[PDB]
Design a binder for this molecule. Structure first.
Ligand SMILES: CCCCCCCCCC(=O)OC[C@@H](COP(=O)(O)OCC[N+](C)(C)C)OC(=O)CCCCCCCCC
Ligand SMILES: CCCCCCCCCC(=O)OC[C@@H](COP(=O)(O)OCC[N+](C)(C)C)OC(=O)CCCCCCCCC
Ligand SMILES: [Ca+2]
Ligand SMILES: [Ca+2]
Ligand SMILES: [Ca+2]
Ligand SMILES: [Ca+2]
Ligand SMILES: [Ca+2]
Ligand SMILES: [Ca+2]
Lengths: 741, 741
């Protein structure tokens, strides 16, 4: 309970380059602790006065220790930590570690190299986190947080590129870099048993979920490519876009300008080329695919629950939850009624920053309104404006993402969560709320609030002059924004994931921190951090959002995400194998709070896809025209047909601007221009009021939302009721375990 | 393992009228078995050849037995079953019965009259169901099913009216009849600990759920009486019903007749009186109350989850689930692939009977259409028709209810569920599906499909001549139908619950099956059955439906259900205390499949209330008139006002019937009559087509459904997220148990 004997068989050794064992070769290295002492203001001795109080207690609890001085830094001392078999047995009786039995699997010790190095490192981390050093001081994480211990980590097995010098050691890192974690192995399956055996259940459940997500994205992408190619093969039979591109019809439709000054009266032919690709993006193929994706997200979640029950059997992820260690920052600071008011102030700060990113979207709006004029002066101006605004908004999103990463850490540190699980849950909800709003607010704007409230040419909506949409619809602008944000997020995040740990290791080598042992090799690496795969999970969840919430705009979002996921498995595996220091293995039975987040996104996606097809697509006005306004009482044709749709949908405007400016008489010499709204013609008794066709179309839009939402929610309820959550073979395996034991 | 010694210390005793102990007075009666043998075709001896094979094994497993002949029937033999302390201890070590500890509560035996008579009867029923008699024959339920044993039951404590003759015995039935189960005690609280102590966890959880449901119905009824009285106090300020009742305005509106022959052109004044009470039933009070009830059902379900976690602590309902005994009818009959096709045939028969009750509703439609003419010949005819049709449809519902009780038993017996829990789950889903459709199909018809598809006077919808609705709306017809069905179901079911076990006991006394002991007194009672409180639960769930799905029609459904529940607690408790034989206590941690059923009804109720307010109420056309058609572009008034609504909503019809009959020229000499639809006037370019006001109103109806559904579902999601499922004091009690143990 005191500091008398430390660091036994302390000697400097450098003879073996690749040895996971001690200098004697009897016992292996379960952990490495790293400190320095030899080089003010009374801080040094005081840490020496505390650090030894830890280490001696480690041998009073049974652990074997042995240090060597570092060969590069004379201050750095590497302490190898090993657990004897008796200490392993008692601290594996405390935590019910499930071992093979004669492979039947049961509690604290079973009948049968017995303990893998992964579960050995888990045992020694439990021991390292429990032992008291001292007021009451709890564990090792407080020492590493307080600058006492520089680094504590388990060792990797070998070099990832070269086979280990030991003949008895299985080169787990090398064989996991050859058959995984390498772009040479992009086609091969994932050795999920091997990656959990090397890494742990958190890493194994992330890569199992990522491989399953990629497999289901392959199905969604095949059906989406089928629907997109159905639109591409019916591209030549679209009546409305051919009528747009015809100069005898679509050329004559002279449109009103959108902004007040320095915007010309434009003919509809400049829409024409975009209109062609627009016929692929709101056809019946994207509607059928939106209904299919409403079914597919439920198949995804139900078969993930089945795969997760399969892994809860196969991997023994359901372990008894020991009482969790409190975080050191909580117990250092140590009423509850005031902590509640601190939490409310924290929530108000979070909603302040959410409203800041809303103001950033308002700034993007004002940018588009200012830059459309100068793009019309200096590939139509609105399409060029939309592509460059997508580029600029993606850059602003990536800039504000890092700033919220930092301030989300600060915001979650200001409130004090006692446990790491409560910390991660609060950070998960807060960080996802910002990433949701930050990544999808521009897309939700272009979908639901862009062009909807503009009014007619006389009396437009002034905030100044909210953005008017294209005659085809803002679906093409949404598709371009989605493609830019999704593909650029994939490319930029993969480039950052490749470079940033690699660049940090490179600058460490250049700061010079020839033959060298395993602990120095692993110490010159990047640590993952207390978060872990948080961000990894976050990224994919964002991608899931982009796949599901916005799938009615373009059906190639599963294909884009599938290409990204096929790259992402390898880039995550490569960085975790080579560039990162080895994490202690943990145990996780699910992906965490991300699964409630995904079920919430699945519920929201039905509403969002119905509102996309109704409001930002132009499928419902086309459908209503064909079925109701080409018949005799409202139209001239005898049978249902789609010709004359563009001439009979756009509304005429005589140049009568209200005197509450009158810009059109300066911008042109024309007297009548057509705009995209369904208001009455001039000279009506109710001129420029909403007409019978508008109210018919908006009733069909709302009836479509109602019918599609209720039908899809009922089909999702029936599919979730029909598919059992646990698989039949997994029930049989659990029943066979209960039968034998 | 064989039949050698049976029925020890067998003697006829009649000296003690009220003795729960044996003739010696040492040991108590845990069970009573009842058989008869002494009075063909070889059946008698064969049952004698089997019955003894049971009883001897009972003493080979340790139970003590003692029979007396009955004093009334010389054939009847009553066998008293007692468990010794050692047998109680071993079979309470098999099933982890939780006893007080020094009241801390833990497993198989604890430190401390020790076993209550309830848990003693539960132990002896476990023993009675496990012991083999014999091919393999399992337990006692097979003997009672096969006519071997006439009756097996635990004894009640005393007479319910009179205190027990024993001085040591607590008169549990009498004290539970004095402070509960008696209309004298209608105001008092429920002794929930005492009723679980006497009866078991299934009965205690039903009465805890019923008392909690009554308490929450008190809150819902107070707010509903507030909203109804707000409508009753604003009854004199309704502009539209006053305009209906005014003979200068509402008298002049001469309406078209509904059916083809023998129905007169009627003025709107005959609606007038109904219109007054109609102003209480679609006001803003019922709208505010519908939003409040969408919140209240979620508060109900969340606080039931909190009360249920409170009872899972306080009552020890979470016991280890022993492997359930298979049902005797399954194991008697004993491939699985053919059993699947039997299940599909069973499902097809169920949907055949559901479509039969749909045809019964179609017959009710044809009845109304036939009887409105003769009610117009022989209190307007449509209101008299609606009240008598509610009476006749309620009688037909009560007639078809019993028929489906019988055929649902037959349908669930045709498929073969192996376990009683799977049997009850399948019967719960099938029986609720029929009770749902049977009780609410007439109400859903009057709400959503009555008067909606009728067409204009020219070209009406012929099936013949689907029913036309009233100018105020079919909400008053729905309110009358709901009040009749709900109040009559309450009154009739309470009268049946009072009489039917009481009448069966009375006819048993009259068939004569003076001083008599406890086992004969309890044998001359009605057994509850293998179902138990199934039907009780069913009834209340139906009531819940009537409270929540249809709450927008009338706000006094919580008050009607609250009066019914205050009566229902006492009538259920009274019949279970006095008229029914004592059930063995069981263990239930929740109400069962009824809680998924209630969550489904809660989800459906939001949709149903939104569609009631939009479609079968007339609030949205009134609101659209006030906000949009009394302004200058569509109306004459300068400010928003509701006068002229009745004259400007109903549509004119010149008598131009299509020649595809022309009944109106025979039924009257009038040339123009007004009907309830929003079609264009005659002489229009689009005459009798739907107009701008119709499409405006239907767009507001669908936008109201969308806004109300999404707002209420979001508020319900936020309330379910904010309210934690387990209570804070209950977390503290569970943590204190984990702290002490
Ligand atoms: C909760 C997750 C997603 C929420 C997104 C909300 C969507 C809001 C968009 C919206 O309602 O737009 C208002 C109009 C749209 O009619 P449009 O004809 O698109 O407006 C004119 C556009 N044009 C001049 C270019 C021809 O539509 C109406 O006037 C009918 C109002 C019904 C909207 C209710 C939806 C959600 C309420 C919670
Ligand atoms: C799932 C649980 C409950 C389901 C109940 C479904 C409700 C069906 C009722 C319905 O849609 O009615 C059709 C019309 C109603 O317009 P009204 O103006 O009431 O019809 C004329 C009536 N009048 C002659 C006396 C003036 O409305 C329309 O034409 C718009 C159609 C939108 C209906 C979609 C709702 C549910 C779809 C799954
Ligand atoms: Ca990435
Ligand atoms: Ca990643
Ligand atoms: Ca499921
Ligand atoms: Ca009743
Ligand atoms: Ca009842
Ligand atoms: Ca909750």
């Amino acid at each position: 309970n005191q500091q008398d004997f430390r660091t036994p068989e302390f000697e400097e050794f450098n003879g073996k380059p690749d040895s996971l064992f001690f200098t004697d070769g009897q016992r292996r290295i379960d952990f490495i602790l790293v400190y320095e002492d030899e080089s003010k203001k009374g801080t040094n001795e005081k840490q020496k006065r505390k650090r030894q109080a830890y280490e001696s207690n480690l041998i009073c609890h049974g652990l074997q220790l042995e240090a060597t001085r570092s060969v590069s830094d004379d201050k750095l001392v590497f302490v190898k930590v090993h657990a004897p078999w008796e200490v392993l047995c008692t601290y594996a009786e405390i935590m019910h570690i499930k071992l093979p039995l004669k492979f039947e699997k049961s509690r604290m010790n079973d009948f049968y190299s017995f303990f893998n190095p992964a579960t050995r490192s888990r045992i020694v981390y439990f021991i390292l986190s429990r032992v008291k050093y001292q007021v009451n001081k709890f564990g090792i994480n407080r020492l590493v947080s307080s600058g006492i211990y520089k680094a504590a980590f388990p060792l990797h097995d070998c070099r990832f590129n070269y086979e280990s010098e030991d003949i008895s050691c299985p080169s787990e890192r090398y064989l996991l870099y050859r058959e995984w974690a390498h772009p040479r192995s992009i086609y091969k399956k994932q050795p999920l048993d091997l990656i959990r055996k090397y890494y742990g259940e958190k890493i194994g459940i992330y890569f199992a979920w990522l491989g399953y997500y990629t497999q289901m994205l392959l199905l969604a992408a095949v059906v989406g490519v089928a629907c997109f190619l159905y639109g591409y093969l019916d591209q030549d039979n679209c009546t409305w876009s051919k009528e747009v591109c015809d100069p005898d019809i679509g050329g004559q439709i002279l449109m009103c300008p959108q902004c007040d000054r320095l915007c010309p009266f434009w003919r509809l032919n400049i829409t024409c080329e975009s209109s062609k690709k627009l016929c692929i993006f709101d056809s019946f193929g994207t509607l059928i695919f939106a209904v299919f994706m409403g079914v597919w997200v439920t198949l995804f979640l139900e078969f993930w629950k089945r795969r997760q029950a399969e892994l809860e059997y196969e991997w023994d992820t359901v372990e008894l939850q020991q009482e969790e260690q409190a975080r050191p920052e909580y117990e250092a600071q140590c009423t509850t009624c005031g902590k509640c008011i601190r939490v409310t102030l924290c929530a108000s700060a979070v909603f302040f920053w959410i409203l800041l990113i809303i103001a950033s979207v308002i700034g993007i709006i004002v940018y588009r309104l200012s830059v459309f004029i100068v793009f019309s002066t200096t590939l139509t101006p609105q399409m060029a404006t939309s592509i460059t605004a997508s580029i600029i908004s993606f850059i602003i999103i990536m800039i504000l993402n890092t700033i919220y990463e930092k301030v989300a850490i600060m915001i979650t540190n200001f409130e004090l969560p006692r446990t790491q699980t409560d910390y991660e849950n609060s950070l998960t909800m807060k960080m996802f709320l910002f990433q949701f709003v930050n990544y999808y607010s521009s897309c939700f704007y272009i979908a639901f609030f862009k062009g909807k409230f503009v009014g007619y040419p006389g009396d437009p909506v002034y905030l100044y002059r909210s953005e008017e949409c294209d005659p085809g619809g803002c679906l093409l602008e949404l598709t371009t924004q989605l493609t830019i944000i999704m593909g650029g997020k994939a490319i930029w995040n993969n480039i950052q994931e490749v470079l940033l740990p690699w660049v940090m290791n490179l600058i460490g080598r250049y700061k010079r921190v020839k033959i060298t042992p395993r602990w120095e090799q692993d110490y010159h690496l990047q640590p993952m951090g207390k978060l872990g795969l948080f961000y990894e999970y976050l990224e994919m969840i964002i991608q899931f959002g982009f796949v599901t919430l916005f799938v009615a705009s373009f059906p190639l979002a599963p294909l884009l995400a599938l290409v990204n996921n096929i790259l992402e498995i390898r880039v995550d595996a490569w960085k975790l194998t080579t560039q990162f220091r080895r994490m202690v293995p943990e145990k996780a039975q699910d992906i965490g709070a991300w699964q409630p987040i995904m079920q919430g996104i699945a519920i929201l996606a039905v509403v969002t896809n119905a509102m996309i097809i109704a409001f930002t697509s132009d499928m419902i006005p086309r459908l209503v025209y064909y079925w109701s306004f080409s018949i005799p009482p409202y139209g001239d044709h005898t049978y249902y047909t789609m010709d004359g749709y563009i001439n009979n949908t756009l509304s005429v405007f005589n140049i009568t601007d209200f005197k509450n400016e009158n810009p059109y008489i300066g911008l042109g010499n024309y007297t009548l221009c057509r705009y995209r709204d369904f208001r009455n013609p001039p000279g009506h008794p109710q001129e420029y009021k909403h007409n019978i066709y508008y109210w018919h179309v908006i009733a069909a839009k709302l009836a479509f939302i109602i019918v599609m939402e209720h039908i899809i929610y009922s089909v999702k309820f029936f599919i979730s009721y029909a598919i059992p959550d646990v698989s039949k073979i997994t029930k049989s395996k659990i029943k066979r375990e209960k039968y034998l034991t």
